[PDB]
Amino acid sequence: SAPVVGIIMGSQSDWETMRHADALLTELEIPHETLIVSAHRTPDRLADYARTAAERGLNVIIAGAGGAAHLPGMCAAWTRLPVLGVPVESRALKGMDSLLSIVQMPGGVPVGTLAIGASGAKNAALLAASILALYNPALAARLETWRALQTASVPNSPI
Amino acid sequence: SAPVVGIIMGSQSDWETMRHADALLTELEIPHETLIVSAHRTPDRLADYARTAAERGLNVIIAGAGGAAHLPGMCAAWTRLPVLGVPVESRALKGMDSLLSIVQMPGGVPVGTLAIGASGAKNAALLAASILALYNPALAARLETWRALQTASVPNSPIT
Amino acid sequence: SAPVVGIIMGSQSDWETMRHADALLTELEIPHETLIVSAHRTPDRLADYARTAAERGLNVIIAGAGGAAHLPGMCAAWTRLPVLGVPVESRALKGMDSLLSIVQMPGGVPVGTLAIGASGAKNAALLAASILALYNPALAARLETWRALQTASVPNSPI
Amino acid sequence: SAPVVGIIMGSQSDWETMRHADALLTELEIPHETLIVSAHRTPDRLADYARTAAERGLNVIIAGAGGAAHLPGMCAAWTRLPVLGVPVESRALKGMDSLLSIVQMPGGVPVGTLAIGASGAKNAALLAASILALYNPALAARLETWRALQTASVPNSPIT
Amino acid sequence: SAPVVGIIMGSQSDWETMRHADALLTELEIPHETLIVSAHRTPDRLADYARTAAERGLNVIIAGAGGAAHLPGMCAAWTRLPVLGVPVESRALKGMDSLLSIVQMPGGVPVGTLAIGASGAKNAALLAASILALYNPALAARLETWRALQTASVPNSPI
Amino acid sequence: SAPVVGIIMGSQSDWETMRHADALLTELEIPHETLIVSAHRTPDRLADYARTAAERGLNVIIAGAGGAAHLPGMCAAWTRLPVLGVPVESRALKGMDSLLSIVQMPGGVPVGTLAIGASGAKNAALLAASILALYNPALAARLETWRALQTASVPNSPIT
Amino acid sequence: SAPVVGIIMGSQSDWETMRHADALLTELEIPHETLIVSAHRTPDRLADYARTAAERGLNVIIAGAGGAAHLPGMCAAWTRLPVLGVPVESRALKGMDSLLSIVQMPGGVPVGTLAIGASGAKNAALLAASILALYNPALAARLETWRALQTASVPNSPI
Amino acid sequence: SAPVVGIIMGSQSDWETMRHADALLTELEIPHETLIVSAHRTPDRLADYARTAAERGLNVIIAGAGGAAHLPGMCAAWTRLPVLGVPVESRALKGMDSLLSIVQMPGGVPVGTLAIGASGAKNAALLAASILALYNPALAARLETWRALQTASVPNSPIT
Numbered sequence A, C, E, G: 001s002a003p004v005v006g007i008i009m010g011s012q013s014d015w016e017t018m019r020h021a022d023a024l025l026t027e028l029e030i031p032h033e034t035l036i037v038s039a040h041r042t043p044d045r046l047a048d049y050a051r052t053a054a055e056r057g058l059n060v061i062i063a064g065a066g067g068a069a070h071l072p073g074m075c076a077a078w079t080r081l082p083v084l085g086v087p088v089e090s091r092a093l094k095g096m097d098s099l100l101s102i103v104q105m106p107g108g109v110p111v112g113t114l115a116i117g118a119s120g121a122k123n124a125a126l127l128a129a130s131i132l133a134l135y136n137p138a139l140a141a142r143l144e145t146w147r148a149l150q151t152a153s154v155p156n157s158p159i
Numbered sequence B, D, F, H: 001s002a003p004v005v006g007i008i009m010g011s012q013s014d015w016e017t018m019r020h021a022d023a024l025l026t027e028l029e030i031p032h033e034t035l036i037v038s039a040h041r042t043p044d045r046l047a048d049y050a051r052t053a054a055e056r057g058l059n060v061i062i063a064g065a066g067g068a069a070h071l072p073g074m075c076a077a078w079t080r081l082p083v084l085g086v087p088v089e090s091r092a093l094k095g096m097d098s099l100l101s102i103v104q105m106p107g108g109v110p111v112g113t114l115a116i117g118a119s120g121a122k123n124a125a126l127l128a129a130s131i132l133a134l135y136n137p138a139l140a141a142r143l144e145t146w147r148a149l150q151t152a153s154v155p156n157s158p159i160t
Ligand SMILES: Nc1cncn1[C@@H]1O[C@H](COP(=O)(O)O)[C@@H](O)[C@H]1O
Pocket: A009, A010, A011, A012, A013, A014, A037, A038, A039, A040, A041, A064, A065, A066, A067, A068, A069, A070, A071, A088, F106, F107
């Protein structure tokens, strides 16, 4: 019941994208929390969230932001937990700024980065699941079923 | 000493970059294997490697490649384990082709991507360590110690 | 009657683009098959398709995918047949990711890459035709007519 | 020994890259010619070359150029044969201008484009070989042998 | 009455852009012709057009094309006349491919390149005018008036 | 001699670039401090530095970093003072990652960004000087003199 | 009452973007002027504006332009005052041309550059405010309140 | 020998590139002047130069600069003469910033832009020559001869 994954996003505007991570976790029955945490507008809220994440029982953090997307990196700066970053597609640069701001982390503080947009949000949740599955047999089985269904469902020819 | 992390790379030329992931895993005392698997030259070798990773005891796979880097993505397609991708810097496009070829995975098959080059390889190892640390108290302490040392080792001013 | 060209695409979403390759082949009366094969979601389906392509009588394979577009490259990894890649325009990066993921193949396993989008799909079919025309006199004549009509039809001034 | 593949390049400076296509065709015993044809400096030479390629017995044309690389595209405009383009790495833009100038052909006139640089030149030759192999059993066996050797030659682990 | 400027474009689809060059020339009363000439679909039409341009009395050629935009460069390859290139905005790459295909001409055969899109088409006509004005006093005066009106008309504050 | 400008950088490797900002401030006689603060390795050090800048007497902060450059942005998040960012050139992406990571701040938290590399560091110092000059007549005269000298020092023709 | 900040933009078309800088300054009660000044269409208007800015009592200049956005740089060339540049999102290149034309100023003449688009316009006004706050206690207090409200207002979770 | 073409550049560092335009004009016997005019460091010098170009007898202006290259555009803003811009290759962005800063002129003030670097400088001179040739029969013949020689000088095959 207690969340094992924390989904944080820099703004309400990122929800359209991050909701895909939320849906996936719920689908796999992975207890999680979904919050808005701005690296620039609420820096202390972020520091506190990242510092206490482990203590609170969180295993993985999924962070999404657009533009100069510093949320994932700064969260990883304060936590030893694995942090997965989702580049939100920005208006002008289409997430290229989001992508480079997240993936190009110097050695020492990692952020496992996923694709720009909804696909990345969905994959961040799937990656968090594959991580949790390493020590949760029941979830490991549900994830196997999910992957098997994805594979089996692909049509053989276009409509 | 059975391996729990597998480091794979498209070619010997990728080793200059991937050796950083290897060194870091060893530093944190994380048993691992290091191999060369070409997605394009040895596709069946990759299929078998990725497909049997979980049963062989691996928990995380770190895959590095450059240019049209398909190794990480195709590895993830065959394993249910988390796959971390390292974009190896390419000659002409400086790893931008490597980066986009790895990170832009469509929904359903994730690849946790790290920075282009050495930093990405080192961070892939650290990311793998933070994953393993979730269920290994001894490793968790070693990683915490490693992180705390990195922080304490930063100088307060530059050598002018 | 048996297909000599195989058109494969990573998803139904690629059909809007790949249908242009299908239309062109039908126009030139080139027997072909059109399938959905995902490099990531159906990896074994792809391995089997590429391995047996030659045995089945296929001469050329046209593969289209977007984003981290690995379909063309991985298909070429398993077949000795010429593989032509069509970069599908992605939402965020407009096919730049699709393009680099396909064209930047290291030495040893080639993929003849065409333009991003519909133009590339149409040209992949025309390129496959020009290849088949080398050993099919009737098709060679139909292709010559097609090229001649394209040239002759261009207006002399804009409307 | 009549040529069945024609390798053309915009200038002597392109040879460093295109020699890889030449070497590979010779390796697979594919008769070919190698020339310099400038789309901008010798437009009529290009027109005549491309226009008469088929009647001269050529089956495939490999064209390489850098910067605003129009050689492949203009060659394709004058021949009905398949034209393969090799983006030669440029000084400032590292072949990105070469790549986009070649691959972005509008509908109606195709250019099968390969990677920027040496890899693209080698792959253009291999692509040409896979095309010729469709109607040449002897070459088909040589290519199959070449591909099988590439696969078998990949090492299982890196030299650390 | 005889055209002194030739506006050529690779396709009817480029007209939306090149019409701005046409309008500007008409505005300055510069006799010109507007044609469709495809470098790839009508290569011989282009060779002939460029070869005979000077003989026909043309002074400047404005050429527009998108994607692998080879029209300007190949036209300049056959004529000694100044050739101005207009990168047409492409669907996927927004004219970046058009721009690089035109501006990156190696030494020896120049193409004076203008901005991507309508602005470039308008400026190609203005540049052609500034060239013609060097030997046409009446046009030089009309161009001076045009520039003076542009400058004088800029509002002092936004509405 | 109390500092009114603070120059901070992510690492010693940034000094090669940031020394230009330091040199220019000293040239214009602007008291300042120069430190290394890592946004990722010493996040709490950064928080404290940025948070206390105003009370410590600083008027402007110049922050430089490369790659995923978060130092300037996070500094601005904790201080109400104007923060100027210098994109340090990165190995693979040549500072493009540095540039976009710094300049693309969302509405609400500004970072006045300068050019990639040495020019940006020098201009950050000059921008800081033009800010301080608004309420420091002596500095205003020194800056005016500096600008007038730059203008007068430009040669009329090149050495051929 | 006399303006202490000058907002200039290359065209009426930039107003949709620059109005955000205007709104912010008015919100913080910072006396300012808002004008249209084209670096290319009204070069002398710009030279005069920049030359006399300081004499007129202006403290900071916010300049916005798109495409080959030279307005900020050329304004800084004529004034000792701090000049802040706002890259306006261009149609084709989405402000990447605007951004590079503004931020890449060689050493000697700076332009503090903000993000592409509305965010940058809003931040240019906030940056100008943080500069003015250094010598205006009342404004410093209003800016502190503004920042505090921004931070306090961020929701804890998405809707 | 009165100059009919004016070559201007932002700094001495631009000369390495712009010397190619100078050499070509001299080769074609086109009287010209070569100066350094900084749009940012000597704005009034630029205004006066561009404003008086036509009355001084100039017919074409070739302007070269790198980075945020405003020299060509601002020159065009003050003269009614055709202005040709040469993007000088920049350190970090390899002339991409130079290119976009020059070519992307909005409607109303044109700058005929050439390739990044040496090729662009040479082509700017050739473009200027083709403009002057329209009303100078002697120069027209010299240019025709120059073009015909370039064509005839292209080798038929590479040195392998
Ligand atoms: N980087 C960052 C830090 N805090 C918020 N953001 C990003 O700011 C962007 C725009 O936010 P908004 O729409 O609230 O202005 C969002 O995508 C969010 O990720």
